[PDB]
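Record type: ASSEMBLY
Status: queued
Input:
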Amino acid sequence: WARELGLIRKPASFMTSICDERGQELIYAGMPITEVFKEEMGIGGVLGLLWFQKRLPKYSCQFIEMCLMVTADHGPAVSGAHNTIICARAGK
Amino acid sequence: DLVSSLTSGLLTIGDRFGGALDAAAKMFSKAFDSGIIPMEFVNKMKKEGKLIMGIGHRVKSINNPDMRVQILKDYVRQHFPATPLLDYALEVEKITTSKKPNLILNVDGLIGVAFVDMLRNCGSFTREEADEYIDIGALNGIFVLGRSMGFIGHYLDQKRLKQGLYRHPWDDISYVLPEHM
Amino acid sequence: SAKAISEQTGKELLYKFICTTSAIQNRFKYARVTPDTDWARLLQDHPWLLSQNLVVKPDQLIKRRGKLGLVGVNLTLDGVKSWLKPRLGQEATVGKATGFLKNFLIEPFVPHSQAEEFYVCIYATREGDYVLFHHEGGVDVGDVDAKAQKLLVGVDEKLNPEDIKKHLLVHAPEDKKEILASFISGLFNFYEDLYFTYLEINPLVVTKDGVYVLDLAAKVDATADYICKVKWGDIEFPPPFGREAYPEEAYIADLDAKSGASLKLTLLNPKGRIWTMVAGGGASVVYSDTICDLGGVNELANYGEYSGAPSEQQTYDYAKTILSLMTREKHPDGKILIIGGSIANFTNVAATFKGIVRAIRDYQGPLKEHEVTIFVRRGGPNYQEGLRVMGEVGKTTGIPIHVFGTETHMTAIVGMALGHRPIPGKSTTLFSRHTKAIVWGMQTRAVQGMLDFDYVCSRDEPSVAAMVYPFTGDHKQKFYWGHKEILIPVFKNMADAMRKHPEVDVLINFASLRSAYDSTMETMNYAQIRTIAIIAEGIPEALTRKLIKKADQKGVTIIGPATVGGIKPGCFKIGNTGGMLDNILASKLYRPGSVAYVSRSGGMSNELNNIISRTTDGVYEGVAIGGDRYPGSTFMDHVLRYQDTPGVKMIVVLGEIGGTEEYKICRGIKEGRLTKPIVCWCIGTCATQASETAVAKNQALKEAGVFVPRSFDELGEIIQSVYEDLVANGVIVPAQEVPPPTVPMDYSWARELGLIRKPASFMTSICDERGQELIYAGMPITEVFKEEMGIGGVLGLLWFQKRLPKYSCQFIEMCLMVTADHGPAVSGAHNTIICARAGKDLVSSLTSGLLTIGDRFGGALDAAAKMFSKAFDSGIIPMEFVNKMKKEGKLIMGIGHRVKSINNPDMRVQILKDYVRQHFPATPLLDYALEVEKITTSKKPNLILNVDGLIGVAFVDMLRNCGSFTREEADEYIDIGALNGIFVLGRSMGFIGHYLDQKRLKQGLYRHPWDDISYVLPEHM
Ligand SMILES: CC(C)(COP(=O)(O)OP(=O)(O)OC[C@H]1O[C@@H](n2cnc3c(N)ncnc32)[C@H](O)[C@@H]1OP(=O)(O)O)[C@@H](O)C(=O)NCCC(=O)NCCS
Ligand SMILES: CC(C)(COP(=O)(O)OP(=O)(O)OC[C@H]1O[C@@H](n2cnc3c(N)ncnc32)[C@H](O)[C@@H]1OP(=O)(O)O)[C@@H](O)C(=O)NCCC(=O)NCCS
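Status: finished
Output:
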């Protein structure tokens, strides 16, 4: 009540310049979610919005998706995939 | 569950929280084997702009001291033969509390210098073992294994109070977004 | 603070760090004789005592021992042994001080004539250093300023021996003229290199063999240890020669040592009636001055302070020591306790009063038994509630307590106490409403105070353009402009701030003493900065004289070296001057007045704001110049700066004892320079060089047309008289009190004074970290270590919040010893080894091993407890339980092994089973589990009771069969997972061991070869 009638004051931590969840639309970096889906940017476009806070050009967006496609699975011999298999086989 | 709650608490024991246990041993033993005075070690450490690890604490001061530092000091004075690095660290502590009262020699610095004393002034560690166990990280493990009891205690307590999901209210945030990206 | 050093350490530093080609003599030939010293070690350590002639003299900072006759001259070893018998342990009398003699210095006696002894004295002043030399030294010189040749060497400049011969050695002997210049130049170089202040070598004796130094005297700038601790070493600063300290005085000295505040106590009279426990620097000397000026010279008991916001425990200890010192003697006329103080800056008055009234309620019986009268005056934030708390304790205890606030004059409290009255070129316009500053450093409290002042003084533009901090990168700090939230950029280097903001002209230097000099020397070469305020403290006198010199060169004015700043109402405020916005709005410092003032200390500036506010129309521009030795701008520069401003109508000046500046005020007003009415008072008369004392400044200023009150009780009366004369003459036209803008206060301040009531999450019934002792479950950490409960005991405190019995604590230590490492084959140890071989770190290796302890690995600690305790509370015979877990699938958890079967036990289940059967009273569930294992060993021999099942059933049995668990907490912890906690905390030792061991064998990255994979991929998806 004392801040709704506007008299108290509060220093607020956690500055977070990404993804304002309040309001009538889920705004990303500066661009709303309906603009994200109308401008037809893939997940590379929202990687540019959330991580870099820039609307990256449409060749860099496809390059970010190409990087997330080639840095997918590379066999289960390697150590991280091996630990995931050990924890899945322990049924976690 | 227990392992995910304790584990998501244990993945913050880094350099600012609780991982000063090894850097307050490496720094205080790298400035004791290249022997300077404490009053020049502090000058060098401020001149380089880096933090003296294991000398600062957010909430405790000299007018509000933490007692767990005193319980360890009164043990390492008696049962420990020949502990000079702790005396060096106490010298640096009072040099820094003469300026700012906030900067008090932590338990994360007292355990580091007392463990270097216990490794290199008791038996069975010569000088390559007792420096390998500082370089490898056997002093962060003391903090992680000690604080696991507290984190499991906090999991059990928040499980027994039947508390709900946490939401962190928007009046503690101040979103500072760009204009229109 | 330049303080004295002993002759032994002076000669030690001289003989060790001198750099001369001259023949120095008697190097490291001196002996220190104490009352506690022996003689065999002395003869073995210094052999020259058995070879030469000896001169012994007391070194307890005794001045002019020749005029007193305490010097042993030309004696043998038995000569000094027979002469030191009435000198060691006898209370000597020197000047006006009778004190113990406990220190003597022995020198080799030298042969010398009257024409060999000279006088060298290098003492520091504001412009530079004075090298004073006299060709006729000794004790009977007398006139130390009327005969000798002086030479002023400027700051940041060197002294050449040709200049010594030209100005200083004109009347030296010719057979000493070549070596004396070398010794004086080396002595000056050593003086400048070790940061002394006043070095007096008398009497120096240059003879044919070399140079002897008979007596020495030296004061060293004690705050230059951060630059010269390697050259000083362990300096033992001696106290002045006087009476030995009382143990309570030494107790408060120890409190000041181990505290962060300033806790001073000195008992002038342990029998008298007037005790004064007054917080503040200048507040204590002002209260003792108006005790002295009201007939209380002889019966003033103590004087001291508790300044700089002490903790509640520390102010309780100080007030307890004062209330115990005023208790042991009786005074039937009546004892008076003046718990005074000025307006505090930011401290909540109710907390310090809470400490003092704890010390009062601890001494209420003796305080009524000894007829005390407590007079309290305090101001600042929440002084209303603080004085109301003190009035509540005065009502409830029954002792007379008289609380006064900002409405009272500062020292009329001691007026109504003793029975005297009843109890009821440089610039001028430095600061403007377009003046933007640059703060240097992370001082967000001071910057938010300045921005709150800029809001409330009706100023449309913030007076912090940017902050500068090189230890972090460039970012944008979040600050509060009224209700609004603004971003203020903190820059790494000052070049970016002076590039993007060319409108600034003032840098507020909040760097510490180890970076303030370099920061303002980096600042002073920038053209836009025309004033510099250095708020730090500890900066040495040599570095601040170099700052004064470069400020006079570059034309900037400096209000730095130990200050709080200075406030110009309506335009600007330097950091933390004034205090909170409560103080700014109560003292009406938001609209421009017509009075200017100068002070030296920053503690009396708030009282000056209060007095001018209550008795005048406001303050136009007020400045405190600093609490250092050589202030960056003295009183006369600010009075001349006030003279050229069209807004000032009168000027108040608050001076102090020491330093000749009010004489410059006298000469400036007499030589036709000052016209506006000056009011002044020099605080701290209290004299119970005599040409620069406070009564000298008062008698000098009273005659010279300056309005000077008699005591400090009448300062506001004099200022009100001068103001009502100036409003009768029609020059002062007071404006109308426009209402200011309002700021919201603070969530922290509103909860501290207690009117907000926010609901708090995170209920946490464990480990109260706050307060003074790390409290565990309900028991402090000192009781944890005193009652010898191990890590099982602190597990019972943190996890279960009960005091577990000593067999159960040792049982939990036994469980954490058996559930440690069990080989690296297992899933969690394997994951820890793979993350350690991928070179990660301890917490990610242990953590990614700990994320396997679920159901199939580490789940038998809890499943074999829930199973054996569900099927024991349902009343089932062990044969029926084995058959019930047969028809439903469901192999019994906690039963089975791979090798150790029977007549070949587990040998770590046997240790736990032995401990439980020997120590646990009334263990039914282990006996039920042993009946089940006796039934199921008949099927297969290797169906022995596992250790993961035995710890489960022994733990459930311990919880529901020992004390302090009922039965519904005793299976609540089983349901929540205290057994999973036992396994995870046990196996963490093994996983950290595996991390360290794979880090120590220096293993490489793991690849898991394709011979052990067998890909079973589809055909073409
Ligand atoms: C833990 C820590 C963040 C707490 O410090 P803090 O109370 O927040 O102090 P702040 O960072 O708010 O204030 C910064 C000022 O104090 C200085 N300072 C703070 N901690 C310092 C430290 N350990 N060593 C040297 N200087 C320190 C900063 O240099 C800076 O100086 P300045 O006044 O000239 O600007 C910090 O001291 C630290 O990182 N210590 C090393 C890690 C550690 O020991 N952690 C155990 C306790 S959590
Ligand atoms: C048939 C044979 C292979 C079975 O041997 P086995 O040791 O009983 O092996 P099993 O796996 O069947 O034993 C499991 C038993 O222990 C029980 N058990 C196993 N794990 C259990 C657990 N955690 N908890 C409770 N019970 C468990 C099982 O329920 C079962 O008991 P059940 O009979 O009540 O069902 C054995 O008898 C044999 O070797 N026969 C060949 C001999 C021969 O003729 N040789 C040729 C002549 S030269």
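Annotation: The pocket of coenzyme A (ligand 1) is lined by residues B 16-17, 20, 51-58, 102-103, 106, 108; C 441-442, 471, 512 (CB under 6 Å).
Annotation: Residues 4 and 10 of chain B are 10 Å apart (CA to CA).
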